[PDB]
Design a protein around this ligand. Structure first.
Ligand code: CA
Ligand code: CA
Ligand code: MG
Ligand code: MG
Lengths: 548, 548
């Protein structure tokens, strides 16, 4: 199998991970000094949030120069040196190719807003790089994604005197992909970084490339054609590199971003369908949704691989769930109106689960058992907290907490002088939660994560095997098998907060002796009926092999 | 039933709990301000460590005035107010009556070491308050209890020119209970405090009162008869008051300290027999030794109630276990030779269990479900650690950690200036393990202890009911029932570090459904055979009720 099927991804922001020069802002030298950490955690691949020059009105997803490194973060030679030292430690590295849009402050748009004609008479090449309208009347059949800041997907530019289109901030005008000169430019943006050694791209907001009147302007076929073109390029010109879709849609729509095998698109897609159901199942102590949503996922092509994740740098999205489910999830997980944003909840993993470690562990054993490659949001392995006094999703992006010293080890600058301020509240602050402490605690959450990644690493079934739900007879107990090679694993997870009993249907496994993946603790051999009784305490997870 | 059969006890030392005036030493004004915390924790009786005038050569167990308050700790009026404020909250308060010995700085011993006759010529009333010998020959049978420090229980006195007896430090001369004027004085001391309102006493070192040649000078008949006289005193003059005994002996000799319904002695004794066997059971993953020592305990009288604990201000003592048993506790639990003191281990509960919460929760639920009244050591409810850089068991007595402020909130004094210096290492120090953090943390070990004493309080079978083990068919799992009034409880606990299976023998409960005490989750009904399949994760505890 390909390398990315086996990997554990780890998602960090250069700017909030480690500061190297005391300016209060994370940078590449700082990241480079921390690399042994990620090596020894069990991480295989760094996913870096955007590092490009940018005015940071969406924290770097408003790219202003696809071919550089933001001054805050180091120089291009810094990047080159970090990329060298990552590969010297067996870490693959992938970027963010922000394809749908650029900053208002990108040269292309500053040039596009001059008009169709230049003041001499000749055409303005760059005007048609972007999406203009004289009235802004087009595409009304579309939803606004940033509901808490934007009123229209059309904004009037003062200079061009007409309306430009954007699915996100008006800082971030949409690029016009019916212009093949623009498709050129981002093949060329990709080649620039692929030639430097980068192993792949998270591609940003792929469902929103092409708009069309009288459609939802999401997931359209021509969008997939643009994306097949990217895969065609990378397969020919840089074999073995990764393409990783951020497609946040319903499951029938998400499987499309893989593509047939005769004409492929991405290699991997995030499993946005299950992420909200993991949390919902917890509060309801009912796993039905998990199995039904895993149910609506087709078989995917040979080269395909899901990226399973719990949280990340954006809010917990709720835009692809039922009106009912969404209401439930706010009631269970956003008690304060301050916790809500944009059809979503902006909290880090540990506070969503009340800092209860039995629950955090439970959800992480599922992340690593469900089929795919698991990606970890930085700091979620020491149990970091949110800071909601910060605006718009910055609250979950606070600086990494390395030790109990100045700014938690993030900078020698004072927390006031940090890009976002290091958390110091009595529960989740760097005085209580930091890596130093958990390296010297025999029992810490950092240690526990590393151990389960070893344990996952020691059974290739978890990364490569099939999935089959077995029926338990009690919706608080979710159970499934994963088979690959001789291995057949059995994973039983109790989503309720008191003891539960189930009656696992294991008729296909009569004769087999289940034992524990930690020290092969023996269980009764499955016999006759196939119907196996089990009892489980609070949030327990049995990880088991079915000999022979 | 009497109050002490229902109480939760909390052990603490006034000197290391709360400083009031920032002089570095804890004091009764500071303790009074924290009674809200103790009441809210669900504690019922405070047990205080000795608070008398003294030179603290054994943290005040070497007493130099029975009817004063050590000035480190306040005035006798500060003590009255504390006592008034504790009762005003429905809290009992018991003291420590050090009976066997007095400081060498006690007025008595200063007088007694002057000889059997004064200079003027009349007899010295005080000389016989202590046990003198001219040779040191006598009582050659006895063992030294402070094995690391004293070579001889006899010590020459420079001034009296003859040897004096001490079972503990040389600076703690033994009182002589063959003089009835000593029994007189300690009845009067005992009265002094009971007249002020104290709800009883822990009597210290009871086995070693009277010494007789040709015996071990422990547990003697004449030591019990002195003690029957104490019970008789409080029985008559102060009905209600608890007598409580520290008797660190094998089970048959421990049970003598209650002393039949005909002429009673103590209302309560520390269950020293089970404690080593709980720790040893956890590391063998084999609970047999817990059942064996509950068996060898004979039934105690009607007024009697065990005192169950895990840790306390002394070392985890091993003086009363096998050579093999002791070798296993030393190997499993004392990797540094330094952690050994006086046949036993000087470490706090959280270090002993590798700071592992699943394990701390395990033992504590066992503390709460075994018959007896449970006593908690101060700060093991937040998971405090130890400081081996202090001498002679003081490592487990560092100041309480209230918050992350100046000395963990124990004082405005710098930690260099505290009586003992607050713990500050990266795992257990007060920047990470403190009460502020855990009152604010939804899922803290403190909140856990409270929510888990409330469960205990909600079921009088825990306090009063019987005890019956059941057979589980797997020595890793420890099950018992407890029955009182309607209620039959069923407590199943896994002592292994990975999932275990067992077949519980529930034959006399067929037709009956076990249900969960938390959130009333019912399990499969016990049927036909009675043989109940169960599975259990890492250090699980099932607290169940049996309908109907
Ligand atoms: Ca677009
Ligand atoms: Ca004595
Ligand atoms: Mg910097
Ligand atoms: Mg003081």
């Amino acid at each position: 199998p390909e390398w990315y099927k086996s990997a554990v991804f780890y998602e960090l922001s250069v700017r909030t991970f480690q500061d190297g020069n005391g300016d209060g802002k994370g940078d590449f030298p700082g990241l480079t000094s921390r690399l042994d950490y990620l090596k020894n955690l069990g991480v295989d691949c760094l996913w870096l949030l955007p590092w490009f020059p940018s005015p940071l009105r969406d924290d770097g997803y408003d790219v202003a120069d696809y071919r550089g490194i933001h001054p805050d973060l180091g120089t291009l030679d810094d990047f080159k040196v970090f990329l060298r030292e990552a590969h010297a430690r067996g870490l693959w590295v992938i970027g963010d190719l922000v394809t749908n849009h650029t900053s208002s402050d990108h040269p292309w748009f500053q040039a596009a807003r001059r008009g169709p004609t230049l003041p001499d008479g000749s055409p303005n090449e760059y005007h048609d790089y972007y999406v203009w309208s004289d009235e802004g009347k087009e595409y009304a059949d579309t939803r606004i994604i940033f509901t808490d800041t934007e009123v229209s997907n059309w904004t009037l530019d003062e200079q061009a005197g007409k309306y430009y289109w954007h699915r996100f901030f008006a800082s971030q005008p949409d690029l016009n992909y019916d212009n093949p000169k623009v498709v050129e430019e981002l093949h060329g943006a990709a080649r620039f970084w692929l030639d430097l050694g980068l192993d792949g791209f998270r591609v940003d907001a792929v469902p929103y490339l092409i708009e069309r009147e009288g459609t939802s302007c999401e997931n359209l076929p021509e969008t997939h054609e643009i994306l097949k073109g990217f895969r065609a390029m990378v397969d020919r010109e840089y074999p073995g590199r990764l393409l990783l879709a951020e497609a946040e849609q319903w499951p029938e729509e998400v499987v499309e971003y893989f593509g047939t095998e005769a004409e492929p698109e991405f290699h991997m897609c995030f499993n946005f369908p299950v992420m909200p159901r993991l949390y919902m199942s917890l509060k309801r102590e009912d796993t039905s949704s998990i199995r039904e949503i895993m149910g609506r996922l087709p078989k995917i092509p040979s080269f395909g691989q899901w990226c399973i994740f719990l949280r990340n740098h954006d809010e917990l999205t709720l835009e692809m769930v039922t009106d009912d489910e969404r209401a439930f999830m706010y009631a269970a997980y956003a008690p304060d109106a301050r916790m809500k944003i944009n059809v979503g909840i902006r909290r880090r993993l540990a506070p969503l689960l009340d800092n209860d470690r039995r629950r955090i562990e439970l959800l992480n054993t599922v992340l690593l058992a469900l089929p795919g490659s698991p990606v970890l949001y930085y700091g979620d392995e020491i149990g970091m907290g949110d800071d909601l006094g910060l605006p718009d999703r910055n609250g979950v992006r606070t600086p990494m907490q390395w030790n109990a010293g100045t700014s938690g080890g993030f900078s020698t600058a004072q927390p006031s002088d940090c890009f976002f301020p290091p958390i110091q509240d009595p529960v989740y602050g760097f005085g209580r939660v930091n890596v130093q402490s958990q390296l010297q605690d025999p029992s810490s959450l950092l240690k526990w994560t590393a151990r389960q990644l070893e344990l996952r690493r020691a059974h290739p079934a978890f990364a490569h095997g099939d999935l089959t739900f077995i029926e338990t007879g009690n919706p608080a107990i979710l159970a499934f098998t994963r088979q690959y090679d001789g291995e057949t694993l059995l994973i039983v997870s109790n989503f309720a907060g008191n003891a539960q009993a189930g009656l696992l249907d294991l008729a296909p496994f009569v004769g087999r002796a289940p034992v524990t993946l930690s020290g092969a603790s023996p269980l009764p051999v499955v016999t006759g009926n196939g119907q196996y009784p089990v009892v489980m305490g609070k949030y327990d997870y049995y990880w088991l092999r079915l000999n022979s």
